[PDB]
Write an enzyme that holds these catalytic residues in place. Sequence first.
Site, PDB file in Angstrom:
ATOM      1  N   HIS A  53      -3.788 -22.886 -23.136  1.00 37.39           N
ATOM      2  CA  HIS A  53      -4.581 -23.377 -24.249  1.00 37.39           C
ATOM      3  C   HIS A  53      -4.542 -24.926 -24.372  1.00 37.39           C
ATOM      4  O   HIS A  53      -5.464 -25.511 -24.946  1.00 37.39           O
ATOM      5  CB  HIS A  53      -4.097 -22.755 -25.546  1.00 37.39           C
ATOM      6  CG  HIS A  53      -4.988 -23.015 -26.722  1.00 37.39           C
ATOM      7  ND1 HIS A  53      -6.325 -22.687 -26.728  1.00 37.39           N
ATOM      8  CD2 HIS A  53      -4.702 -23.516 -27.957  1.00 37.39           C
ATOM      9  CE1 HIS A  53      -6.820 -23.003 -27.913  1.00 37.39           C
ATOM     10  NE2 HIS A  53      -5.871 -23.518 -28.675  1.00 37.39           N
ATOM     11  N   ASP A 105      -5.953 -19.133 -20.887  1.00 33.18           N
ATOM     12  CA  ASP A 105      -5.760 -19.307 -22.298  1.00 33.18           C
ATOM     13  C   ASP A 105      -5.445 -17.959 -22.982  1.00 33.18           C
ATOM     14  O   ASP A 105      -6.250 -17.042 -22.908  1.00 33.18           O
ATOM     15  CB  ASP A 105      -6.999 -19.971 -22.877  1.00 33.18           C
ATOM     16  CG  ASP A 105      -6.813 -20.554 -24.262  1.00 33.18           C
ATOM     17  OD1 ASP A 105      -5.956 -20.060 -25.032  1.00 33.18           O
ATOM     18  OD2 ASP A 105      -7.574 -21.557 -24.568  1.00 33.18           O
ATOM     19  N   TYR A 163      -5.307 -26.439 -34.896  1.00 36.59           N
ATOM     20  CA  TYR A 163      -4.332 -25.910 -35.872  1.00 36.59           C
ATOM     21  C   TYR A 163      -2.925 -26.367 -35.503  1.00 36.59           C
ATOM     22  O   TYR A 163      -2.540 -26.353 -34.339  1.00 36.59           O
ATOM     23  CB  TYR A 163      -4.434 -24.383 -35.848  1.00 36.59           C
ATOM     24  CG  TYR A 163      -3.731 -23.649 -36.961  1.00 36.59           C
ATOM     25  CD1 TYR A 163      -4.172 -23.724 -38.270  1.00 36.59           C
ATOM     26  CD2 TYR A 163      -2.679 -22.802 -36.671  1.00 36.59           C
ATOM     27  CE1 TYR A 163      -3.602 -22.966 -39.276  1.00 36.59           C
ATOM     28  CE2 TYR A 163      -2.090 -22.045 -37.670  1.00 36.59           C
ATOM     29  CZ  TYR A 163      -2.525 -22.155 -38.979  1.00 36.59           C
ATOM     30  OH  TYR A 163      -1.983 -21.362 -39.952  1.00 36.59           O
ATOM     31  N   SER A 180      -9.630 -26.541 -29.767  1.00 40.19           N
ATOM     32  CA  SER A 180      -9.124 -25.294 -30.398  1.00 40.19           C
ATOM     33  C   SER A 180      -9.950 -25.017 -31.656  1.00 40.19           C
ATOM     34  O   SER A 180     -11.172 -25.025 -31.553  1.00 40.19           O
ATOM     35  CB  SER A 180      -7.614 -25.415 -30.583  1.00 40.19           C
ATOM     36  OG  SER A 180      -7.030 -24.150 -30.895  1.00 40.19           O
ATOM     37  N   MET A 181      -9.343 -24.860 -32.836  1.00 41.43           N
ATOM     38  CA  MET A 181     -10.155 -24.767 -34.040  1.00 41.43           C
ATOM     39  C   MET A 181     -11.043 -25.978 -34.236  1.00 41.43           C
ATOM     40  O   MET A 181     -12.098 -25.884 -34.822  1.00 41.43           O
ATOM     41  CB  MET A 181      -9.320 -24.589 -35.301  1.00 41.43           C
ATOM     42  CG  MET A 181      -8.744 -23.179 -35.524  1.00 41.43           C
ATOM     43  SD  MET A 181      -7.852 -23.151 -37.093  1.00 41.43           S
ATOM     44  CE  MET A 181      -7.397 -21.460 -37.203  1.00 41.43           C
TER      45      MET A 181
HETATM   46 CL   LIG Z   1      -2.093 -20.250 -23.653  1.00 45.18          CL
END
Ligand SMILES: [Cl-]
Length: 277
Positions: free
Chosen positions: A221, A189, A70, A143-144
């Site tokens: 992350h 994360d 994202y 991620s996504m």
């Molecule tokens: Cl993070």
Amino acid sequence: SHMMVPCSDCSNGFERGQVPRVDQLESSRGPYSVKTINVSRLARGFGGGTIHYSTESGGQQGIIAVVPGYVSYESSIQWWGPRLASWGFTVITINTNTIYDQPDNRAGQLSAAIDYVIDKSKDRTSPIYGLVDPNRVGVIGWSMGGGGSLKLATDRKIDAVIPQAPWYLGLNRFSTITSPTMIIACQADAVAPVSVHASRFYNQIPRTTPKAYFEIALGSHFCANTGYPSEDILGRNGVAWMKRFIDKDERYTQFLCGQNFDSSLRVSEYRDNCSYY
Ligand SMILES: [Cl-]
Ligand code: NA
Ligand code: NA
């Protein structure tokens, strides 16, 4: 039929090249020179990107597509392109149709990007004409995009999956994934907490499906992205993963199994089911 160039550096099926040293796997490049093709946003079903490929070893190459998260662009994940292409894969790193696209949409875009490469491999004007094996494909996503990579494995035959700092919300078929999956997790994360996302997804996947959980100590992350400090070790395991599960190259199991990776201060946890490789 479509013309396919044989692998000229293969034996034992698709086992390409010589067995490397660990330090070679940790290096920024493997044995082959990386060439690139720009793919504009006019490409069907995704937002363009970059094809990375090498030609020294001939064809029958596995195809890998790599997708970001994202509100992010190709650069976040682009390191995988030259890293894997230099080891004899044809690798497309992508932008999405929009930066706001959700995981299931990102899964379809990974699929579209694979298909784009397959289509180009049938195009006599393309540098990758005849270079690829459409039957051997993998995906990587952040991620996504990592959620999307796991989703796609449930919808299409995928030989290997690398979700990094994956995020997914809602009902899923991860309990039925049969694609060898190496989840890269970032210990600290706060965006896709590993207790909710990465670790749960690892635990869902069938015991008989080869899997790994590679957790980077203290990682945010972003800990698996281009330019971050674990490119060396993440890329070592990722190249081995794709060699082992896309090329079916069992010379690479030795790099993945019995290593006690979490003895290093850099690696907070490593899980595997190596007895099922
Ligand atoms: Cl993070
Ligand atoms: Na497009
Ligand atoms: Na450790």
